[PDB]
């Protein structure tokens, strides 16, 4: 299955970070946000993977992640020329995509659990219809809105929300997306909605529903406040528990993607902070 990372744009809610600085280059802790969400693609064994960004962001990402060859994937690049939505992505990515299935996940989101890896490559494995995720909040009404029982309804911060499960920023289609995004009509404002996507998919009875309740962590990236207790979280499990969210390189490590001699040679030209040792103890023992 292939993958697109959809960046995102801006954002202004975090001015003054991001007057020179990309939103997904930001720190999370220790590490770019866009790091994250590659990450859960990797971790769901998709490793043919479009990065969309903006014009002015995609030689930045270009120059932290290259072609993908250190971490045993390939990346590729396309811009959004305009913002016109997150359904774009299929147009854009129409070539890129062929005839296979594809997963979108959204520059800015932050996902972590035990047990999430099994869900993402459950959902990878899915040669038919789409896979969602439902995320337990506070504040339904300003995210996409997943209604159940199985799924019953999908809106799109719907005023009056019919449950607190926000549709989060991740979605495995197989290849019908592609057509189902050329057939969306444009909402008011026009954009390209992916919850009319997933509404194609609900009406095929074929929409999938994953809730991530108990133990699993989707975090906020939207304001400084929210932006800090991500680090923190992540800082928190790391140190507290031992494990690195995220971390490109030990994943690919534990994929099989890349040899022991080739994640010492990731480790080699960068012997020195905690990332680095985390790194090259791995590959011993």
Not at 10 to 26: A, C, D, I, M, N
Not at 36 to 47: D, F, N, Q, R, T
Not at 161 to 174: E, H, I, N, R, W
């Amino acid at each position: 299955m292939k993958g697109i990372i959809l960046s995102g744009g801006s954002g202004t809610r975090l001015y003054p970070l991001t007057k020179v600085v990309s939103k997904q280059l930001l720190p999370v802790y220790d590490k770019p946000m866009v790091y994250y969400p590659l990450s859960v693609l990797m971790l769901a064994g998709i490793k043919d993977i479009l990065i969309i960004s903006t014009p002015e962001d995609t030689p930045r990402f270009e120059q932290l992640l290259g072609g993908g060859s250190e971490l045993g994937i390939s990346l590729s690049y396309a811009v959004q020329s305009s913002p016109d939505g997150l359904a774009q992505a299929f147009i854009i990515g129409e070539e890129f995509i062929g005839d296979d299935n594809v997963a979108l996940v959204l520059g800015d989101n932050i996902f972590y659990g035990h047990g999430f890896t099994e869900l993402l490559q459950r959902a990878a494995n899915r040669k038919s219809g789409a896979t969602i995720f439902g995320y337990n909040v506070k504040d339904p009404q300003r995210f996409g809105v997943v209604e159940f029982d199985k799924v019953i309804s999908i809106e799109e911060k719907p005023e009056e929300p019919k449950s607190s499960y926000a549709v989060t920023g991740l979605y495995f289609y197989d290849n019908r997306v592609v057509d189902i995004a050329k057939n969306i009509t444009p909402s008011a404002r026009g954009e390209l909605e992916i919850t009319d996507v997933n509404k194609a998919y609900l009406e095929l009875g074929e929409l999938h529903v994953e809730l991530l309740g108990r133990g699993f962590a989707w975090l906020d990236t939207g304001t400084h406040e929210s932006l800090l207790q991500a680090s923190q979280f992540i800082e928190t499990i790391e140190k507290r528990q031992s494990l690195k969210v995220a971390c490109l390189e030990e994943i690919a490590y534990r994929m099989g993607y890349i040899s022991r001699e080739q994640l010492i040679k990731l480790a080699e030209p960068l012997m020195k902070n905690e990332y680095g040792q985390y790194l090259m103890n791995l590959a011993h023992r």
